[PDB]
Amino acid sequence: KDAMKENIEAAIAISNSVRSSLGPRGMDKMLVDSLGDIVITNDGVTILKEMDVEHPAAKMMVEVSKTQDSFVGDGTTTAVIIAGGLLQQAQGLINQNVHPTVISEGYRMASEEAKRVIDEISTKIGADEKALLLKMAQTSLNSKSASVAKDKLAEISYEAVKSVAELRDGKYYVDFDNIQVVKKQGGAIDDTQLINGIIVDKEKVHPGMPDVVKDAKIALLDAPLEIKKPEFDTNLRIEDPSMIQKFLAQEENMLREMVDKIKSVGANVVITQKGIDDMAQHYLSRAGIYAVRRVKKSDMDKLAKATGASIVSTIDEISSSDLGTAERVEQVKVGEDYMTFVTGCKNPKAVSILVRGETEHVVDEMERSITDSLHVVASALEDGAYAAGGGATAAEIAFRLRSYAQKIGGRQQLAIEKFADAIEEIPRALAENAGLDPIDILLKLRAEHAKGNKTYGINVFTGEIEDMVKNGVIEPIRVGKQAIESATEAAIMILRIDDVIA
Amino acid sequence: KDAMKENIEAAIAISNSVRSSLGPRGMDKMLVDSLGDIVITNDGVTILKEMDVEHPAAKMMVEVSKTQDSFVGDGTTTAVIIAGGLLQQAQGLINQNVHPTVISEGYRMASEEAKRVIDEISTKIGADEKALLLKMAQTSLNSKSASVAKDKLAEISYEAVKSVAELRDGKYYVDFDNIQVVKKQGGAIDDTQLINGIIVDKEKVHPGMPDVVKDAKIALLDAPLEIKKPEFDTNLRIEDPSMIQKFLAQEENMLREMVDKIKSVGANVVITQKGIDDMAQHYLSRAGIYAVRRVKKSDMDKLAKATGASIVSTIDEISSSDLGTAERVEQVKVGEDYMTFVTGCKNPKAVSILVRGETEHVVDEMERSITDSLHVVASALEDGAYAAGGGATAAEIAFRLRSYAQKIGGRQQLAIEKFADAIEEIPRALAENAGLDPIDILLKLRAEHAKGNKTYGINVFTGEIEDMVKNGVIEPIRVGKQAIESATEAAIMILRIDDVIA
Amino acid sequence: REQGKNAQRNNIEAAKAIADAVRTTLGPKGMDKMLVDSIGDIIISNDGATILKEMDVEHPTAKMIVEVSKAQDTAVGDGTTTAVVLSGELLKQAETLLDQGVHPTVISNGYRLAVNEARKIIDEIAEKSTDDATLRKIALTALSGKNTGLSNDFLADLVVKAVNAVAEVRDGKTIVDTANIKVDKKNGGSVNDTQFISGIVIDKEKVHSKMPDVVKNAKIALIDSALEIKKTEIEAKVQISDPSKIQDFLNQETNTFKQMVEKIKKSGANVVLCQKGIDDVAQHYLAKEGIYAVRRVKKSDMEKLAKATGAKIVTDLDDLTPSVLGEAETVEERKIGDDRMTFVMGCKNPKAVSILIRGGTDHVVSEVERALNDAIRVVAITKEDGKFLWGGGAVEAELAMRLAKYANSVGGREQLAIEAFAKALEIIPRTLAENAGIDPINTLIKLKADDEKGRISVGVDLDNNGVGDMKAKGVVDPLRVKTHALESAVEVATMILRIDDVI
Amino acid sequence: REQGKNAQRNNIEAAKAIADAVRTTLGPKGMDKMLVDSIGDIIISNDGATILKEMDVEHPTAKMIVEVSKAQDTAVGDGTTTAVVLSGELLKQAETLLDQGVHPTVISNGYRLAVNEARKIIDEIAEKSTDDATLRKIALTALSGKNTGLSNDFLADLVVKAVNAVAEVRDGKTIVDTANIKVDKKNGGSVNDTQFISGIVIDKEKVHSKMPDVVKNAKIALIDSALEIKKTEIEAKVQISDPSKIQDFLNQETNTFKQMVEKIKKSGANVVLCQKGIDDVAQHYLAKEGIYAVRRVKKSDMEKLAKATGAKIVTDLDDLTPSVLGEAETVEERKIGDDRMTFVMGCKNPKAVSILIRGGTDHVVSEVERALNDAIRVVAITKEDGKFLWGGGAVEAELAMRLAKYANSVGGREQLAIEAFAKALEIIPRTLAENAGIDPINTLIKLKADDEKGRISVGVDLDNNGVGDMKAKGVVDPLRVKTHALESAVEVATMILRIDDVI
Structure with a gap:
C-alpha cells in the first residue's frame, strides 16, 4: 500500500530529473558535490552516477536502470524514462486491485514481445556502411553540446572505429584498447583530431x-x-x-x-x-x-x-x-x-583522438560526447543492423503491443497495454522537450504506424512526423533492446517490494 | 504545475476519507473535535461538515461537493467520490499537456450528456407506489447502522411521508414542517414509533x-x-x-x-x-x-x-x-x-416519529438515518421516477459517454472518456467495500451494459451482477443528477486554479 | 486519525479496558472501587453506573461504552456491569472473525440475529409470579454484593413493603411510581434503625422554637413564595420629608408581615411549608399564632x-383558600441522629411512604441508600411485569446453549457471528466464577451439562463451589433489565464495530 | 537544486556578476583591483587572468567563467577580460530570447553560426606585417592600462629586442620560444634601470667569498647532485675498535670532498652551477682551486x-667529461639593488637573453613584470603569425555590422540569435567608452557610421573623445588572442545556456 506508494514516487522522481535531457532539444544538468566538484553533462550515465540519491528505491532505480551491459548512446536515459512510465502506470493498475504479480508477468511478456518487434522491424546495414554509420554518429552528437561540431566529430568517430575494427567471421569486432582518447584544453572544439x-x-x-x-x-x-x-x-x-x-x-x-x-x-x-x-x-x-x-x-x-x-x-x-x-x-x-x-x-589498428575545448569543463564534456559516438558506431558495426530513431521504433513497438495484448487477453492484457503506454513516454519526452504538443504529435504518430509507417518519427526541427531513416536519425539496434530490458527489470523489482525495513 | 499538483492531492484526500462509507458494506467514521465532542456516522454530509480540513482546496472540495441543493440519500458521498475521480483523471491528462480549459469543457459536456442518460434510462413510479418506495427506503437504511431495523423504519418512513404529501397537480408536494422527528434514548431501536x-x-x-x-x-x-x-x-x-x-x-x-x-x-x-x-x-x-x-x-x-x-x-x-x-x-x-x-x-397531515436507541450516540445516528429515509421516499414521490442502484446507472452512464465521446471527437473526447472512467469510481468503491474484486466486477459490469442490460448492478451480498430493480436496490432520480452536478463543478473549480496566494 | 485495522483493533482494545474496570463488581462477591477526585473527594461504590459516571475516561470509544450508565432501562443493579462486560466480550469475540476475513457488517448482522433470538428465548423461558415472596427474593438478590451488613432480609422486607404501599392498578395493570417512595438517610448508626414511615419525611426543622413540636389534624399550606418583604418590579424610591413618616414606614413593614400571617390563619392552615425563606418577623407572628x-x-x-x-402549591397568598390545603393526621418534629426532621404522617x-436509612459511617449509609434505591427499582419493575429470570449466569448459559444450535440453522458467515455471540454470553458465568474465586473453566463445563440436561435454573453456586440450583437458593433477576442489558450491548458493539477510521 | 527558469535566470545572473568584477580593467584607462587574502596578503593587478585566478568565486556557474583564466590561448593581456565580459553579454542577450520563447539550443546554434562567421571575417580583414615597427605597436598597446609609468616606449623596445633575439626560423616559418627569454626583477628603483642582458641572469651569489668575482672564457659544469657526503641506501653503521680509526674516518670524509673537486677540475670546468647544496669543505676546496x-x-x-x-646536466661526477661542459665568455657576479646576482654572458x-626589471615599490615591479610577460607573449605570437587587428573596439564594431547583415541571410529563429550575438559584440566598444568616462551611447552611434562608411580601423578614441582612427594612433591587437577570446566565450556561454537544472 504505502511502502509501494512511496517507493514508486521516489523512483519516478529520478525518471523526471533526467527526462528533459533526451534528444536534439535536450538540456544538460549541472551536478555540484559536497566537496564542491562540478560536472555539467547530458550523459545520463554520468548524471545518475553523480546525483546523490538517498531513498533506497531511488538507489535501485539508478543501479538497475543503468543499462550497465553497455553504455551506447542514450540507452540509460531511455531506460530510466521508460521505468518511470512503467511504474507510474502500475500505480494506476494497483489502484484497481490488480495483483503486482499479474503486472510483473504482463511486463515480462510485453518486454519479450518488444525485443521481438525490434529484431523484426530492424534493418541490416548494407553496402551503405559509411553513410549510415556517419548518420548514426551525428544523431548521437546531436543531443550533446558537441552538436556544434557534429560533422567533424562524426567523421573522427567513424575513421577511428573503422581503423580498429576486425572483420572476423565476415563479422566485425571492435577492441577499444586500440582507441586512445585524450583530452587537452586550450584549443577550439574544431581542433580535435585523430592521430x-x-x-x-x-x-x-x-x-x-x-x-x-x-x-x-x-x-x-x-x-x-x-x-x-x-x-x-x-x-x-x-x-x-x-x-x-x-x-x-x-x-x-x-x-x-x-x-x-x-x-x-x-x-x-x-x-x-x-x-x-x-x-x-x-x-x-x-x-x-x-x-x-x-x-x-x-x-x-x-x-x-x-x-x-x-x-x-x-x-x-x-x-x-x-x-x-x-x-x-x-x-x-x-x-x-x-x-x-x-x-x-x-x-596499425591503434589510434588516438586528441579532444580539444577552450575550458576544462568544456573539454570534459567533449570527451564524454566523443566516447559516446565511438560506442554508437562501434555497436552498429558489430550488431549489423539499425532501428529508426525519433520515437519511430517506440511508437511501432507500442502499436504492436496493443495488438498482442488482445491475443494474450485477460488481466495480463491490462499490464501489456500499460506497457505500451509507457513506451510512449519516449515520443512524449521528445515532443515535450522540443516545444511541440505531446498529445498532438502522439495522435499523428499512432496514425502513421497504424497505416504501416514503421519508420515514422518526430522531426523536432520541422515538428513533423516523417521517415526517420530518410532523414538519417537512426540508432544501433542494441540501444533499444537493452533500454527496454533494463527498464522492465527496474520496474519489476520495485513492484515486488511491499515493505522496507532496517 | 505544482499549485495544481498540490490542490488536486488535497482534494483527492477528502475523496478517500469518505470512499469506504459508500453502500451496504460501507463503514462509519468517528469524528472527535478539539472540545472533545464525538460524532460517529455514515452520513457523508455530517462527515464533511465535521472533518477539520485545513487546505483551501479541501475546504472548497467540501463546500462545492456538498450537493447542497438537497441531502437525499448518499448524494454527497457519491458526488465527492466522483470529484476525486474526475480530478485524479485530469492529473493524467495534464501530464500529457492537455490544457485545463479543454478538460473543463469536456467535463461540462459529459456532465450534460450524463444527466440526459439518466432522464432517459429512468423509470416512472406507477401503480407500484407503496412497494417501490418501501424498497427505496430500505436500500437507504441498508447503508446505515439502522439496517438492523430497516423493514420497520422503512414502513415508518413511508407512512410518515405519505401522510403529509399533497397530491396537487396530479403531482406530489411534501412539506417537512409537517414531520416532527424527535429522539429519546432508553429504548431499543425497535421501539421507534410514528405518532x-x-x-x-x-x-x-x-x-x-x-x-x-x-x-x-x-x-x-x-x-x-x-x-x-x-x-x-x-x-x-x-x-x-x-x-x-x-x-x-x-x-x-x-x-x-x-x-x-x-x-x-x-x-x-x-x-x-x-x-x-x-x-x-x-x-x-x-x-x-x-x-x-x-x-x-x-x-x-x-x-x-x-x-x-x-x-x-x-x-x-x-x-x-x-x-x-x-x-x-x-x-x-x-x-x-x-x-x-x-x-x-x-x-391531520401532521406527524411525529419518536426515535429510540439505548445510548445517546446510538439514538443520534438513528435520527440521522431516519431523516435520510424520509428525504429519499419524499424526493422519489416528488420526482415520480427512479433509477437503479448498485452501480447499474453509473455503469450505464459510463457506457453511454464512451459512445458520445467518439461523436464529439477531438481533445474534448479525451476529457469525456476520462469522465466515464471517473463515474466508474462508484462501482469500484462498492466492489472494494464489499470485499469483491473491482477489476473483475467492472469487466462483467461493462459486458452486461454493452449487451443492453441497463439495470444491471452489483449485488454485494451474492457478489453477482444482477437486475437491480428486480432485487429492489433503487434510488430517486434526483440523487444521481445532483451528485454528477456537484461533482463536476467541484472538479472544474480546482482545475481552473493555477495559483494560491494570500 | 487512525484507519482500518489500526483503528479497529484499537477501538476493541479500548472497549475491553473499560469493561475490565467494572468487571469485579459483578455478583454477591463483588468488590468496591474507590474513586477520588480533587475537591469533593472520595466515593466508594459497587454500583457500576456510579463508577462509570464518575470515571475519567479519556478515549472516545471508551466514552461510548460509558454511555450505557445513562440508559435508564439498563443502569439498575448489575445491569450496567452486565451490558459493559458483554460489549467488551462481543467486541473481543469479533476481533477473531475480523482476523479470519469476516466483514464487520455481517458480524453486526450475526449479532442482530443472535440478540433477536435471545430476546425471544427469554420471554419464552421467563418465569411468571407476582408473589410477594418472589419480590423479596428480587430485593435480596439486588442487595447481594453490597456493604450493607447482614440486615439484608430486613431491608428486602422494607422494599417490598414500600413498593406494595404505593403500587396501584390502572386498567387491569399494576403501575408503581417509585417517585412516591421517599428515601432519605441520616448518619445515626445501626442500619436496623432504618424506618418505614407512612408519610413524607422532610429533612427540615421548624423555623421557630416557640412553634409546636407536633400538630394533629393538620391543614397544610404549601407555599411557593418567600414570606418576606417584596419590592416592586419598576424601581421605587421612598422620600420622607416629615420625621414622623419614618416610623410609619417602618410600621407598614410590620403590618405587611402581620397580614401575611392573617391570610394564612384565615384559610385554616395550621402548618406552612414554604419553598423559600421566611422573614424573622413573619416567624414571630406565625409562632405567635x-x-x-x-x-x-x-x-x-x-411536589x-x-x-x-x-x-395545591400556591404562590399568591390571596389564592390561599381552604380548598388548596392538604391534610395529614400529624405533623411532628422529632430528632433523628443529630438533626431535627419534620414528619408529615x-x-x-396513602400511596406515599418514606424510608429513613441509618448506618453511621456516612460512606456506608450512602451506598446502602444507593443499594436500597436499585432494590426499590428492581422490585418495582417486577411488581409490574410479573415475570423474572433465574440468576447466577443461569440465563446466559441457557442462551449460550440454544444460540449455539440456532447458529446451525443459519448461513455460513452469519453462523460464525452467532457462534461468537453464544461464546460471548459465557463471559457472565465465568466472571461470577472468577470473582467468587472458583475455577472458571470447570464451572462452565458443569454449567453447560446441567442446562443441556434441561436444568434451566442451574447457575453458579459459591456454596456448592461450582454450579447449583438458583431456584432453591432464590437468586432471581428481573426480566426488563436482562433484555435491555443484551440489547444495549449489541447496539453499542455494532456502533463501534462499524468504525474504520477515527479522525 | 533549481530547475528550469529559476535555474537559468540564476546562472545568467551569476555569469554577469563575475564579468562585472573585471569589466573596469579593460583598456588604456583600466583600473586595478586589490585582492587581499589571510596570510600571503595583498595583490594589486590590472591583469584579468590574475584577478580571476585569485578571486574567491563561490557560485558554480561563476567558477565556470573563471576557467577562462586558464585557457592559455586567451589569457594574455585583455584576452581574459574580453572573453569574460563577452560571455556575460552573450548570456545576458540570450535571456531576452529565452523570454520570447526561443529554445536554448537554437540560441546556441545561432551563436555557433555567428562565431564561425566572425572567425572568417577577421581572417579576411586581418592586417599582415612582420614589421618590427608593428611589433613595437603591439607591445605599446599591451602595456597601455598598467602602472608602468611613462617608460613604456623604453619597455616596448626591450620586448621587440628580446623577441627578435631568440626568434628562429624552422621550415620557412618563424618560431619564438618565449622560454628562452629569462625575465626577472629586482626592487632597485627607476624602471628605466631595466636591463637587456645577452645571457642568463641568475638570482644567486657565489657560495664562497674567496671565489673570483668574474670568470672569463668559462667552461661551465651543470650539476644535478649535492656536493655533500652521501650515505648508502642499505643502512650502514661504522664500528671503531681502535682509537686511531676515528681520525682516519674523519679524514676519509675530507678526502672524499677533495676528490669531488679533483674530478671537477679534471674536466676543465672553472664554474660549477649546482642545483643542490655544496658542503662547506667542498666550498673550501673549490675556492682554493x-x-x-x-x-x-x-x-x-x-634547464x-x-x-x-x-x-649537459650531469648527476654522476664520473661522467663529468669536457664534452658535457657549457661555454660562456664571462661569468661574473655583480650587485643588483641589495642582492648579488650571477651573470652568465x-x-x-645566442638565442637566450634576460630582462632584469627594476622599479622599487615591489608591488609595482611585480605588475610591471606581469606586464612585460604579457607583452612578450603578444609580441611573440604576432612575430609568428605575421598578422594583427585594429584595436579600440574597431574589430568588434566591424563584426557587429557584418553579422547584423549575415543574420538576414539566415532562418527565423537562428537569425534572432545572430542579431543577439551582433549586439553582444558592442559590449566591448561600450566598455571602453565607459571606462574612459565618455558617453557610451553616442560613441557607439559614431563608431557604427564610420565602420559602415568603410572605415575598418576606427576604434574608440579617448583623445578625440569618441571615435578615431586606430591606424594613426597605432592601437593593435594580435589575431590569435581575438579569435580565441570569441571562441572561449561562445563555448562557455553554450555550456551554461544548456543547463536547466542544477542539483
Whole structure:
C-alpha cells in the first residue's frame, strides 16, 4: 500500500530529473558535490552516477536502470524514462486491485514481445556502411553540446572505429584498447583530431633526453628503476674507512647495470608505470634513451597492444622479444603541456583522438560526447543492423503491443497495454522537450504506424512526423533492446517490494 | 504545475476519507473535535461538515461537493467520490499537456450528456407506489447502522411521508414542517414509533397544571408572560407608606389580567417561546391551563401548522381566531423524561416519529438515518421516477459517454472518456467495500451494459451482477443528477486554479 | 486519525479496558472501587453506573461504552456491569472473525440475529409470579454484593413493603411510581434503625422554637413564595420629608408581615411549608399564632407533599383558600441522629411512604441508600411485569446453549457471528466464577451439562463451589433489565464495530 | 537544486556578476583591483587572468567563467577580460530570447553560426606585417592600462629586442620560444634601470667569498647532485675498535670532498652551477682551486642554462667529461639593488637573453613584470603569425555590422540569435567608452557610421573623445588572442545556456 506508494514516487522522481535531457532539444544538468566538484553533462550515465540519491528505491532505480551491459548512446536515459512510465502506470493498475504479480508477468511478456518487434522491424546495414554509420554518429552528437561540431566529430568517430575494427567471421569486432582518447584544453572544439598512434600525456623524465627517436624499440616496464633492498634485515658493517667508497660505488653500479641490460637488448625508449631513480635518469639520459615514468596502467596496456611489447616486471630477465616497435616516439607540445606521441606503431589498428575545448569543463564534456559516438558506431558495426530513431521504433513497438495484448487477453492484457503506454513516454519526452504538443504529435504518430509507417518519427526541427531513416536519425539496434530490458527489470523489482525495513 | 499538483492531492484526500462509507458494506467514521465532542456516522454530509480540513482546496472540495441543493440519500458521498475521480483523471491528462480549459469543457459536456442518460434510462413510479418506495427506503437504511431495523423504519418512513404529501397537480408536494422527528434514548431501536400528532420534548411549567386536556384550544405565544417596563426611564415615587401595598397589587394585577385575556378568549393550553413569570405560572395553574415555556422556534412553527394557530407577540391583542385546535394535549413520560404530545390536530397531515436507541450516540445516528429515509421516499414521490442502484446507472452512464465521446471527437473526447472512467469510481468503491474484486466486477459490469442490460448492478451480498430493480436496490432520480452536478463543478473549480496566494 | 485495522483493533482494545474496570463488581462477591477526585473527594461504590459516571475516561470509544450508565432501562443493579462486560466480550469475540476475513457488517448482522433470538428465548423461558415472596427474593438478590451488613432480609422486607404501599392498578395493570417512595438517610448508626414511615419525611426543622413540636389534624399550606418583604418590579424610591413618616414606614413593614400571617390563619392552615425563606418577623407572628412553619423546602419535597396531602402549591397568598390545603393526621418534629426532621404522617393519600436509612459511617449509609434505591427499582419493575429470570449466569448459559444450535440453522458467515455471540454470553458465568474465586473453566463445563440436561435454573453456586440450583437458593433477576442489558450491548458493539477510521 | 527558469535566470545572473568584477580593467584607462587574502596578503593587478585566478568565486556557474583564466590561448593581456565580459553579454542577450520563447539550443546554434562567421571575417580583414615597427605597436598597446609609468616606449623596445633575439626560423616559418627569454626583477628603483642582458641572469651569489668575482672564457659544469657526503641506501653503521680509526674516518670524509673537486677540475670546468647544496669543505676546496660555484640553483634555471651554454646536466661526477661542459665568455657576479646576482654572458647559444626589471615599490615591479610577460607573449605570437587587428573596439564594431547583415541571410529563429550575438559584440566598444568616462551611447552611434562608411580601423578614441582612427594612433591587437577570446566565450556561454537544472 504505502511502502509501494512511496517507493514508486521516489523512483519516478529520478525518471523526471533526467527526462528533459533526451534528444536534439535536450538540456544538460549541472551536478555540484559536497566537496564542491562540478560536472555539467547530458550523459545520463554520468548524471545518475553523480546525483546523490538517498531513498533506497531511488538507489535501485539508478543501479538497475543503468543499462550497465553497455553504455551506447542514450540507452540509460531511455531506460530510466521508460521505468518511470512503467511504474507510474502500475500505480494506476494497483489502484484497481490488480495483483503486482499479474503486472510483473504482463511486463515480462510485453518486454519479450518488444525485443521481438525490434529484431523484426530492424534493418541490416548494407553496402551503405559509411553513410549510415556517419548518420548514426551525428544523431548521437546531436543531443550533446558537441552538436556544434557534429560533422567533424562524426567523421573522427567513424575513421577511428573503422581503423580498429576486425572483420572476423565476415563479422566485425571492435577492441577499444586500440582507441586512445585524450583530452587537452586550450584549443577550439574544431581542433580535435585523430592521430594514427598512441598519445601519452607525459614528458621525458630528464631534460637531457632526446625530443624524438626514429625507429623506436620500446621497453615497457612495470617495475621501478631503483636499487633493490634485500627482504631479510640487512646492514652494511663498515670498520675500514676505505670501504665507504667501495660501497657507494657498488650501489651506483647496480643502477648503471640495470640501464646497461635494457640498453644491451636494443631498447631505445623506456616507459615505466613506476619510478626512475635520479641516477638512473642520468644514465638513461647519457645513453640517449627517451624515458617516461609513472605512466597510467591503462596507457601501458594500450602501448603494449600497439607496439607489441610485453610489460616486464623483472628487468634482469628482459629480452629483445619483449621490446615493442614504432616508427617514431617524440615529445610534442600540445598547448601548454608536453606529451609523448608514439607514432607508426607495429600494430596499425591503434589510434588516438586528441579532444580539444577552450575550458576544462568544456573539454570534459567533449570527451564524454566523443566516447559516446565511438560506442554508437562501434555497436552498429558489430550488431549489423539499425532501428529508426525519433520515437519511430517506440511508437511501432507500442502499436504492436496493443495488438498482442488482445491475443494474450485477460488481466495480463491490462499490464501489456500499460506497457505500451509507457513506451510512449519516449515520443512524449521528445515532443515535450522540443516545444511541440505531446498529445498532438502522439495522435499523428499512432496514425502513421497504424497505416504501416514503421519508420515514422518526430522531426523536432520541422515538428513533423516523417521517415526517420530518410532523414538519417537512426540508432544501433542494441540501444533499444537493452533500454527496454533494463527498464522492465527496474520496474519489476520495485513492484515486488511491499515493505522496507532496517 | 505544482499549485495544481498540490490542490488536486488535497482534494483527492477528502475523496478517500469518505470512499469506504459508500453502500451496504460501507463503514462509519468517528469524528472527535478539539472540545472533545464525538460524532460517529455514515452520513457523508455530517462527515464533511465535521472533518477539520485545513487546505483551501479541501475546504472548497467540501463546500462545492456538498450537493447542497438537497441531502437525499448518499448524494454527497457519491458526488465527492466522483470529484476525486474526475480530478485524479485530469492529473493524467495534464501530464500529457492537455490544457485545463479543454478538460473543463469536456467535463461540462459529459456532465450534460450524463444527466440526459439518466432522464432517459429512468423509470416512472406507477401503480407500484407503496412497494417501490418501501424498497427505496430500505436500500437507504441498508447503508446505515439502522439496517438492523430497516423493514420497520422503512414502513415508518413511508407512512410518515405519505401522510403529509399533497397530491396537487396530479403531482406530489411534501412539506417537512409537517414531520416532527424527535429522539429519546432508553429504548431499543425497535421501539421507534410514528405518532399521529406533534410531540414536543417539554413538560408543563408548573406542577399543579393538568396532565391532559381533551379538546384543546391552543394559544401559541412568542412573547414572555411578564410585567412590561416602560421604554422611557421610570421611577415609582413613594411618599405615603400606604402606596407600597397599592403598587405591588397593581403589578400582580397586570399579570393576573394577562392570564385573564388568554383565558377569556377560550385558550386551554399556552405554549410560549419565551418565559413565564412565576406568578403567571401560578395564575395559569389556578385557571387550569396547561402551559409549557421556552419552546424551540422550530417546534412553534410545526405546532402552528398542525393546530392552525397563529403565533402571537401581542398578548393584549390576542383573539380566538388565533387559537389552534387539537383533540388532546397530554404530558406522557417517555423513558426518563416528560414530553407533551399534541394529538388529533386540526391539520391531520401532521406527524411525529419518536426515535429510540439505548445510548445517546446510538439514538443520534438513528435520527440521522431516519431523516435520510424520509428525504429519499419524499424526493422519489416528488420526482415520480427512479433509477437503479448498485452501480447499474453509473455503469450505464459510463457506457453511454464512451459512445458520445467518439461523436464529439477531438481533445474534448479525451476529457469525456476520462469522465466515464471517473463515474466508474462508484462501482469500484462498492466492489472494494464489499470485499469483491473491482477489476473483475467492472469487466462483467461493462459486458452486461454493452449487451443492453441497463439495470444491471452489483449485488454485494451474492457478489453477482444482477437486475437491480428486480432485487429492489433503487434510488430517486434526483440523487444521481445532483451528485454528477456537484461533482463536476467541484472538479472544474480546482482545475481552473493555477495559483494560491494570500 | 487512525484507519482500518489500526483503528479497529484499537477501538476493541479500548472497549475491553473499560469493561475490565467494572468487571469485579459483578455478583454477591463483588468488590468496591474507590474513586477520588480533587475537591469533593472520595466515593466508594459497587454500583457500576456510579463508577462509570464518575470515571475519567479519556478515549472516545471508551466514552461510548460509558454511555450505557445513562440508559435508564439498563443502569439498575448489575445491569450496567452486565451490558459493559458483554460489549467488551462481543467486541473481543469479533476481533477473531475480523482476523479470519469476516466483514464487520455481517458480524453486526450475526449479532442482530443472535440478540433477536435471545430476546425471544427469554420471554419464552421467563418465569411468571407476582408473589410477594418472589419480590423479596428480587430485593435480596439486588442487595447481594453490597456493604450493607447482614440486615439484608430486613431491608428486602422494607422494599417490598414500600413498593406494595404505593403500587396501584390502572386498567387491569399494576403501575408503581417509585417517585412516591421517599428515601432519605441520616448518619445515626445501626442500619436496623432504618424506618418505614407512612408519610413524607422532610429533612427540615421548624423555623421557630416557640412553634409546636407536633400538630394533629393538620391543614397544610404549601407555599411557593418567600414570606418576606417584596419590592416592586419598576424601581421605587421612598422620600420622607416629615420625621414622623419614618416610623410609619417602618410600621407598614410590620403590618405587611402581620397580614401575611392573617391570610394564612384565615384559610385554616395550621402548618406552612414554604419553598423559600421566611422573614424573622413573619416567624414571630406565625409562632405567635401557633402555626408550625418550615422554610426553604426542596421543590422535589414540595411536589411529593402536594401529592401526598392533596395540597395545591400556591404562590399568591390571596389564592390561599381552604380548598388548596392538604391534610395529614400529624405533623411532628422529632430528632433523628443529630438533626431535627419534620414528619408529615397520615396523609390524605396513602400511596406515599418514606424510608429513613441509618448506618453511621456516612460512606456506608450512602451506598446502602444507593443499594436500597436499585432494590426499590428492581422490585418495582417486577411488581409490574410479573415475570423474572433465574440468576447466577443461569440465563446466559441457557442462551449460550440454544444460540449455539440456532447458529446451525443459519448461513455460513452469519453462523460464525452467532457462534461468537453464544461464546460471548459465557463471559457472565465465568466472571461470577472468577470473582467468587472458583475455577472458571470447570464451572462452565458443569454449567453447560446441567442446562443441556434441561436444568434451566442451574447457575453458579459459591456454596456448592461450582454450579447449583438458583431456584432453591432464590437468586432471581428481573426480566426488563436482562433484555435491555443484551440489547444495549449489541447496539453499542455494532456502533463501534462499524468504525474504520477515527479522525 | 533549481530547475528550469529559476535555474537559468540564476546562472545568467551569476555569469554577469563575475564579468562585472573585471569589466573596469579593460583598456588604456583600466583600473586595478586589490585582492587581499589571510596570510600571503595583498595583490594589486590590472591583469584579468590574475584577478580571476585569485578571486574567491563561490557560485558554480561563476567558477565556470573563471576557467577562462586558464585557457592559455586567451589569457594574455585583455584576452581574459574580453572573453569574460563577452560571455556575460552573450548570456545576458540570450535571456531576452529565452523570454520570447526561443529554445536554448537554437540560441546556441545561432551563436555557433555567428562565431564561425566572425572567425572568417577577421581572417579576411586581418592586417599582415612582420614589421618590427608593428611589433613595437603591439607591445605599446599591451602595456597601455598598467602602472608602468611613462617608460613604456623604453619597455616596448626591450620586448621587440628580446623577441627578435631568440626568434628562429624552422621550415620557412618563424618560431619564438618565449622560454628562452629569462625575465626577472629586482626592487632597485627607476624602471628605466631595466636591463637587456645577452645571457642568463641568475638570482644567486657565489657560495664562497674567496671565489673570483668574474670568470672569463668559462667552461661551465651543470650539476644535478649535492656536493655533500652521501650515505648508502642499505643502512650502514661504522664500528671503531681502535682509537686511531676515528681520525682516519674523519679524514676519509675530507678526502672524499677533495676528490669531488679533483674530478671537477679534471674536466676543465672553472664554474660549477649546482642545483643542490655544496658542503662547506667542498666550498673550501673549490675556492682554493679557483672555481666559481653557485648552489641550490632552480631547475628552471638549470634547464635554461643548459640550453644557453650547451652544457649537459650531469648527476654522476664520473661522467663529468669536457664534452658535457657549457661555454660562456664571462661569468661574473655583480650587485643588483641589495642582492648579488650571477651573470652568465656570451653563451655558446645566442638565442637566450634576460630582462632584469627594476622599479622599487615591489608591488609595482611585480605588475610591471606581469606586464612585460604579457607583452612578450603578444609580441611573440604576432612575430609568428605575421598578422594583427585594429584595436579600440574597431574589430568588434566591424563584426557587429557584418553579422547584423549575415543574420538576414539566415532562418527565423537562428537569425534572432545572430542579431543577439551582433549586439553582444558592442559590449566591448561600450566598455571602453565607459571606462574612459565618455558617453557610451553616442560613441557607439559614431563608431557604427564610420565602420559602415568603410572605415575598418576606427576604434574608440579617448583623445578625440569618441571615435578615431586606430591606424594613426597605432592601437593593435594580435589575431590569435581575438579569435580565441570569441571562441572561449561562445563555448562557455553554450555550456551554461544548456543547463536547466542544477542539483
